[PDB]
Amino acid sequence: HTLVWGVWVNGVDQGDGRNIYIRSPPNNNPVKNLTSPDMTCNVDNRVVPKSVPVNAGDTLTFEWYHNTRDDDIIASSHHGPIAVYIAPAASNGQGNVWVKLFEDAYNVTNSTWAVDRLITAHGQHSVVVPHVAPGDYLFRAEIIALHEADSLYSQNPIRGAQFYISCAQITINSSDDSTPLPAGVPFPGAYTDSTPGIQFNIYTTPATSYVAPPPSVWSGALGGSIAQVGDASLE
Numbered sequence: 747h748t749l750v751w752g753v754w755v756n757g758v759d760q761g762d763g764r765n766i767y768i769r770s771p772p773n774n775n776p777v778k779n780l781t782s783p784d785m786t787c788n789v790d791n792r793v794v795p796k797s798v799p800v801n802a803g804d805t806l807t808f809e810w811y812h813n814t815r816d817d818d819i820i821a822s823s824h825h826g827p828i829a830v831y832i833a834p835a836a837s838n839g840q841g842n843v844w845v846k847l848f849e850d851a852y853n854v855t856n857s858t859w860a861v862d863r864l865i866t867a868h869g870q871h872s873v874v875v876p877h878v879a880p881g882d883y884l885f886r887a888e889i890i891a892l893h894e895a896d897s898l899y900s901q902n903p904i905r906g907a908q909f910y911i912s913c914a915q916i917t918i919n920s921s922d923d924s925t926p927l928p929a930g931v932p933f934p935g936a937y938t939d940s941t942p943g944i945q946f947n948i949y950t951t952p953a954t955s956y957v958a959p960p961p962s963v964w965s966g967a968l969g970g971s972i973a974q975v976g977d978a979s980l981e
């Protein structure tokens with residue numbers, strides 16, 4: 747149960763974005779229905795009044811929280827992967843438009859899931875803004891919690907993978923457009939009951955065997971990481 751508070755750009759806090767530049771839902775409940783329009787940008791998908799200006803090569807950091815800013819972020823138990831996608835704003839997230847910029851699932855050396863690393867990072871994870879066409883974009887951050895993913899929602903609606911989905915409105919100003927955005931996957935649609943990583947038993951299957959849901963990260967992606975970039979208690 748987690749939500750995005752706002753973003754940082756190059757280590758600078760852009761301020762509380764909730765219902766301002768983040769298309770925030772009313773609470774931290776998960777989305778579970780893989781075929782629902784809620785998979786696109788969560789349950790209150792509408793244009794919000796502001797959009798954060800960035801340039802290609804900038805570091806864009808999502809900052810998540812549970813109940814209040816810089817709290818425990820999400821239950822540590824609730825192990826799973828994190829991804830970030832981009833699409834053009836003109837789509838409103840419809841169609842084959844979502845391109846993957848980042849993926850983290852399980853790290854074998856530290857024996858840590860992305861969710862646990864996120865807690866350590868005080869809710870912060872980042873992508874480097876790619877060299878796409880200048881214009882308006884949606885960046886869709888997605889956390890999948892797997893604690894009930896030994897079942898499928900479609901078969902048992904009281905269980906299933908849990909999706910915490912947040913869309914930020916981002917305006918890319920300076921960019922040479924040298925890696926124009928390729929075709930994307932649809933949400934809903936990309937994830938189905940047979941997709942690797944959707945149904946998994948984290949209690950009995952080794953984490954080293956986990957495979958995150960495709961698609962793979964776009965070759966045009968410029969980087970990203972789960973790591974604290976700024977201190978919320980100060981800025």
Ligand SMILES: *[C@@H]1O[C@H](CO)[C@@H](O)[C@H](O)[C@H]1NC(C)=O
Binds near residue numbers: 780781782903
């Ligand atoms: C899941 O979403 C689909 C598409 O909107 C909808 O038809 C179906 O009723 C939903 N399932 C449940 C259990 O609400």
Ligand SMILES: [Cl-]
Binds near residue numbers: 821
């Ligand atoms: Cl959770």
Ligand SMILES: [Cl-]
Binds near residue numbers: 760761762
């Ligand atoms: Cl603020």
Ligand SMILES: [Cl-]
Binds near residue numbers: 777778782
């Ligand atoms: Cl749902």
Ligand SMILES: [Cl-]
Binds near residue numbers: 793
């Ligand atoms: Cl709208």
Ligand SMILES: [Cl-]
Binds near residue numbers: 815
């Ligand atoms: Cl708060």
Ligand SMILES: [Cl-]
Binds near residue numbers: 867
């Ligand atoms: Cl960190």
Ligand SMILES: [Cl-]
Binds near residue numbers: 905
């Ligand atoms: Cl149950």
Ligand SMILES: [Cl-]
Binds near residue numbers: 802877920921922923
């Ligand atoms: Cl550039």
Ligand SMILES: [Cl-]
Binds near residue numbers: 928
């Ligand atoms: Cl394009």
Ligand SMILES: [Cl-]
Binds near residue numbers: 780781936
């Ligand atoms: Cl679908």
Ligand SMILES: [Cl-]
Binds near residue numbers: 850970971972
């Ligand atoms: Cl990472």
Ligand SMILES: [Cu+2]
Binds near residue numbers: 748821824891
């Ligand atoms: Cu939860």
Ligand code: NA
Binds near residue numbers: 894904905
């Ligand atoms: Na449940």
